[PDB]
Structure formats: C-alpha cells, structure tokens
Amino acid sequence: PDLCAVYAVQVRCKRLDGLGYWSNWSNPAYTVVMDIKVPMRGPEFWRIINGDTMKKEKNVTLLWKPLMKNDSLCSVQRYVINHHTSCNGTWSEDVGNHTKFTFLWTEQAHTVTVLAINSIGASVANFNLTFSWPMSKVNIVQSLSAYPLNSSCVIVSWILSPSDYKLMYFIIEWKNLNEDGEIKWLRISSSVKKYYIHDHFIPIEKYQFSLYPIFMEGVGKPKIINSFTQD
C-alpha cells in the first residue's frame, strides 16, 4: 500500500514435499527510502494580491502547502512554477524548497501551474490557476451565509445564480478580522452547496468569509461576508 515506508521482511524455507519441520526466520531486510515514481499530484496553491486598485501591475504571492506522503510519494526535491501568457508564451521559474513565491501580474490573462520535482521527474497531475481581469468581474454567487455550529465547526452555505461559464470548483477563503492571522483557504468541488469548515472559531470575533468561484477563464468575483448571519 505504501511505496515509501520501511518494510521488515523475513524468509524461511523447507522441502516442498512437507517431510520435516519448518525452520526459523532469517534476518529482517529493510527497504531503503528512495524515489520509485514521479509525484502523483502537485500542491494546491492560492494567491494573495498586493496592489492598489489604480495600478495595472499587482504582486501575486502564491502560497502552497508541502505535499503529504500520499501525494509526494517519497520526497519532493523542488517546486517549479510554470507560467503561461498570451504575449511572453510559456516559461518556467524554479522556486526550490520554498513554499511561497511572489511574482508580478501585468497581462490580461496569466495561467500559473506548480510542479513538484524529485530525483525522477515532475509531478503528473498539476493544478492550474488562471488570473484574468475581465473574469474578475463575473459574480455568480447570489448569496452567501455562515452559521456557527460551535467553536470547532461552521456551516458555510451559498446560493448561486446561473452562469454561461463553466464553473470548475470553489475556493473558500477565511481569516480573522480581529487578529493578523494567516489567510486560510480550502478548495471544494463546484457541486458542493454547503460545507462544514472545521477550525477554531470564536463567535465573538468577526471572521471574513470569501467565496471565490473558479472557472476555466479565470477566477470570478468573490462573495464576501464579514459576520455570521443572525437571522
């Protein structure tokens, strides 16, 4: 089941015809943790946009988490970010062991892909995210609401308007408005309409919940709420 765990193996032998006993086990042989295949799936990444609305150029900081043993298999030597633009074409920038990378967004459409590379090669299944200025104005989430079940779970529900664009998946972004905590995000399927976010939530403190509709053309206009619905 696991291709990168240490396995103890002991072997013993006897005659095929069965006349006798069965001997004791041999010395245990242990596998050496080495790369067997290329990584199965690339890391999920999200963007932080730093820039005034009056500026055409915005700093996009991509944050991704290190891959688990299921996705990284054995290890990830480095991460490389491949860019896709209508003007500059396709180029790849090596990030290395860093889990964050800041670049500049200037063009109308920019596709970003993250690949995890080990001693054998790059990852097979890699997530791509498209940044598009016209697509940022498309809003399909008619309404969004949050209900605190307790300090450890919050129900987030949304009602969507019909859209001509193909909706791929949702990305829920939440953070604390009373503290300078890290901006948390989670990728959910587009067919999901209500989700149970399990985190330490304080009902007194205000939490900003942002829902980002993701499409083939790019990220849609997020629906943002700043407090739990008391109705």
How does DSSP classify residue 41? B
Of 147, 154, 74, 72, nearest to 114 (Cα)? 72
Phi/psi at 37 (nearest 5 deg)? -130, 170
CA torsion sign for 217, 219, 220, 221 is negative
Of 111, 101, 142, nearest to 219 (Cα)? 111
Measured in whole angstroms, the distance separating CA 37 from the mean position of its chain's CA atoms is: 21
CB neighbourhood size of 129 (10 A): 19
Of 46, 39, 92, nearest to 65 (Cα)? 46
Provide the 3-class DSSP secondary structure of residue 134.
helix
Structure tokens at 229: 């619905």
Structure tokens at 92: 């790849």
In angstroms, rounded to a whole number, what is the distance separating the alpha carbons of residues 170 and 186? 8
